[PDB]
Amino acid sequence: RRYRWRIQTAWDAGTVGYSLFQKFTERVKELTDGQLEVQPFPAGAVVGTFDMFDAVKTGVLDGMNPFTLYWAGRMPVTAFLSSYALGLDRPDQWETWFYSLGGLDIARRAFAEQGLFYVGPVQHDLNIIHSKKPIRRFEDFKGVKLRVPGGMIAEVFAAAGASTVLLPGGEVYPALERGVIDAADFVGPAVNYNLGFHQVAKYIIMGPPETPAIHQPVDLMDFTINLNRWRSLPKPLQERFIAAVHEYSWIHYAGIQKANLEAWPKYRQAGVEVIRLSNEDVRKFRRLAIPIWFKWAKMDKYSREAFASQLEYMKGIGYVTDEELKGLSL
């Protein structure tokens, strides 16, 4: 018997990300000798991006390739299954945490309670911010209407005085064009260019060279499958799909990074100015961020479990000092 799964991605059609996702479906067919095929759908083709969770839960979709933290408002732990401000900031650190420090099992247990099978994380990129007006220091965030992906990311910017809004990446261009928002984070340079941000915002705001991505340094995607659908798939094919997703994680990461190298010169040609914040701006954000990490960790049992092991790992690699954790504990 052969299996066919409908899977929608958070990537919009006409982006480098969707092209990579389409190629993944061909790779899955190849690795399973046609026994398991994935029918790809670009963002919004079946349901809205933020509605994918419920669509997969019910079976309208068989699976999804979202940015994991989109479920932060309903599953606290998902804010810890993708990067948060000023924490672990390299792809390899998130890979180690998931694959040898216990992160994958925490994600699987949390998603199983929701009737979903979390396959694994998909590496991707850091994220940048586009702004219509210059934001040159920490204090310039006050009063900025900023699109962000909710959760802990939005909470940190709200603590910096911004008015945050949640919108799918495909709605950012018209929101900026119409002046509904002043600035927007979405993903890295290449996809944001595919979406036209350079024509509706003349600035890019990044951290200093020492900390280029303050809010989302490792913006992970994942594959999450309807649990019944997953359990119905023969084990040999389940294992081949897990391996296919892990291989794709890095093929996707590499494809996005190649496109990003090609994108920076295009921003220069479009007259977009890249503004770099300072090391002191980062210290200000850090004092806002750390207590917010603990607030989120304290929401439920899974968020606490995930943050506890990430905090131990950060201490082990010198990312956090005991002094800056004064008054904060699990």
Phi-psi region at 59: left, alpha or beta (left = phi > 0; alpha = psi -120 to 50): left
Q: Work out whether 140 is an interface residue with Ca ion (CB under 5 A).
A: no
Q: Which of 82, 83, 123, 127 binds Ca ion (CB under 5 A)?
A: 127
Q: Work out whether 5 is an interface residue with a second copy (CB under 8 A).
A: no
| Identity of the residue, 98 or 302, whose beta carbon is nearer to a second copy in the bound complex | 98
Q: Which of 95, 155, 171, 185 binds Ca ion (CB under 5 A)?
A: 185
Tell me if 185 is assigned to a ligand binding site: yes
Q: How far apart are CA 330 and CA 310, in angstroms?
A: 12
Partner that binds at residue 99, options a second copy, Ca ion, none, CB closer than 5 to 8 Å by kind: a second copy
Q: How far is the CB of 216 from Ca ion (least distance, A)?
A: 5
Stretch that binds a second copy, among 138-146, 192-200, 286-294, 309-317 (CB under 8 A): 309-317
Q: How far is the CB of 152 from a second copy (least distance, A)?
A: 23
Q: How far apart are CA 208 and CA 275, in angstroms?
A: 9
Q: How far is the CB of 195 from Ca ion (least distance, A)?
A: 12
Q: Which residues contact 235 (CB under 8 A, 6 or more apart)?
A: none
Stretch that binds Ca ion, among 113-121, 122-130, 159-167, 257-265 (CB under 5 A): 122-130
Q: Which of 251, 275, 299, 325 binds a second copy (CB under 8 A)?
A: 251
Q: How far is the CB of 251 from a second copy (least distance, A)?
A: 6
Q: How far apart are CA 63 and CA 41, in angstroms?
A: 10
Partner that binds at residue 327, options a second copy, Ca ion, none, CB closer than 5 to 8 Å by kind: none
Site map (CB under 8 A) of a second copy, residues 27-66, x = contact: ---xx-x---------------------------------
| 164 close to 154: Cβ distance less than 8 angstroms | yes
| 152 close to 292: Cβ distance less than 8 angstroms | yes
| Cβ neighbour number for residue 165 with a 10 Å cutoff | 16
Site map (CB under 8 A) of a second copy, residues 102-141, x = contact: ---------------------x------------------
Q: How far apart are CA 80 and CA 288, in angstroms?
A: 17
| 193 close to 263: Cβ distance less than 8 angstroms | yes
In the chain, how many H helices and how many E strands?
Answer: 12, 11
| 109 close to 101: Cβ distance less than 8 angstroms | no
Nearest to 21 by CA among 263, 262, 248: 248
Q: Which of 178, 209, 269, 322 binds a second copy (CB under 8 A)?
A: 209
Nearest to 92 by CA among 267, 265, 250, 278: 250
- Note the residue count of the chain: 330
> DSSP 3-state assignment of 16?
helix
Residue ranges for the known binding site for substrate are: 70, 127, 147, 186, 216-219
Task: Provide the binding-site residues for Ca ion, judged by CB under 5 A.
Answer: 127, 185, 216
Task: Provide the binding-site residues for a second copy, judged by CB under 8 A.
Answer: 30-31, 33, 90-92, 95-96, 98-101, 123, 209, 236, 239-240, 243-244, 246-247, 249-251, 253-255, 257-258, 261, 264, 313, 316-318
